[PDB]
Design a binder for this molecule. Structure first.
Ligand SMILES: Cc1ncsc1-c1ccc(CNC(=O)[C@@H]2C[C@@H](O)CN2C(=O)[C@@H](NC(=O)CO)C(C)(C)C)cc1
Lengths: 141, 104, 87
């Protein structure tokens, strides 16, 4: 379902990381498999060659937390106007307080020890069920 | 520009915003609306410094880049009971417990 | 403006805009203008209120969004509160 269209029509794009995270760009290939691309450090940008109809999403490279691109989940390069590149502004979402707490707790506790935390089972499961691109693709389908 | 504040007295903490251009007195009017005490019965402070009614919040060091939504700046508050003002007293928040071992 | 009072387990009274407190469906339920939280101490509830301000300010906003900061020492309790408050 979610896959890039094989258009072969070039589209130049600026990946602009306006988040404080290290960004992993992910291209959804023609079979819908996520292909990881080189990372962007916080606040950096890359001019890259993509194609019209191609699908991209962006993650925290270390934790796979979700990020937004031009305020949404998916970025699809369009036709370049006047030879100008398309801007893909990558930003933090406003996470729910729960998700943000899960992030911080995940960053401090090794996964083997989530079960040692003194919290209800559902929260242990929430911690173990960490962000993952495949999970989101099924969701987005 | 908006500044984001905690106005604090004893065990009372008001979360609100105001304009950098707004005055200390105008902030007392905000406090008046909430806690029902007029400006003449309020003293506002930045740390230990008594704030003058006519000054802007900006002038008194509350700026949009220091008084942030996710980390608001503190304005101290003291009431006058009858003749004289109480001293500025802000009760600390509770202390977090020790980190569990698995978080170290 | 309509304000509500959120009171921590240790007796700290937090006064926030009603609209901000309704970020939490749990708080909405508890209101239908004060709510006492027997399990949420002030070092946690103060942060909850700061989250409300942060969320209202940066939701549907184009200006770059900063990270919501959470000290390691409060993260576990804040998580528990967030789960209760559903926010
Ligand atoms: C340097 C960099 N940093 C962060 S991402 C990145 C980077 C590096 C190389 C590229 C080279 N471009 C591609 O690989 C594009 C992106 C995507 O649209 C797919 N793609 C292709 O060139 C694909 N080609 C076509 O679709 C030809 O029609 C193949 C070769 C992967 C199949 C793009 C971004």
């Amino acid at each position: 379902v979610l896959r890039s269209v094989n258009s072969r029509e070039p589209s130049q794009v600026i990946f602009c990381n306006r988040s404080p995270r290290v960004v992993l760009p992910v291209w959804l290939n023609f079979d819908g498999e996520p292909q990881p691309y080189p990372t962007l450090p916080p606040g950096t940008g890359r001019r890259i060659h993509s194609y019209r109809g191609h699908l991209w999403l962006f993650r925290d490279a270390g934790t796979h937390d979700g990020l937004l691109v031009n305020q949404t989940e998916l970025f699809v390069p369009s036709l370049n106007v006047d030879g100008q590149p398309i801007f893909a502004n990558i930003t933090l979402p406003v996470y729910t307080l729960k998700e943000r707490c899960l992030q911080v707790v995940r960053s401090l506790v090794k996964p083997e020890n989530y079960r040692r935390l003194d919290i209800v089972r559902s929260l242990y499961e929430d911690l173990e069920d960490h962000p993952n691109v495949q999970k989101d693709l099924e969701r987005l389908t | 520009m908006d500044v984001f504040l905690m106005i604090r007295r004893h065990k009372t903490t008001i979360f609100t915003d105001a304009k950098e251009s707004s005055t200390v007195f105008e902030l007392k009017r905000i406090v008046e609306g909430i806690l029902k005490r007029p400006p003449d019965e309020q003293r506002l402070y930045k740390d230990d410094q008594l704030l003058d009614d006519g000054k802007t919040l900006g002038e008194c060091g509350f700026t949009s880049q220091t008084a942030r939504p996710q980390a608001p700046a503190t304005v101290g508050l003291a009431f006058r009971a009858d003749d004289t003002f109480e001293a500025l007293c802000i009760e600390p928040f509770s202390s977090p417990p020790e980190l569990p071992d698995v978080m170290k | 403006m309509m304000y509500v009072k959120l009171i921590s387990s240790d007796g700290h009274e937090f006064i926030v805009k009603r609209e901000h407190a309704l970020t939490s469906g749990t708080i909405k339920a508890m209101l239908s203008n004060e709510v006492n939280f027997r399990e949420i101490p002030s070092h946690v509830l103060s942060k909850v209120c700061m989250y409300f301000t942060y969320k209202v300010r940066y939701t549907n906003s184009s200006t770059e969004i900063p990270e919501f900061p959470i000290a390691p020492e409060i993260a576990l309790e804040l998580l528990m509160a967030a789960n209760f408050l559903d926010c």
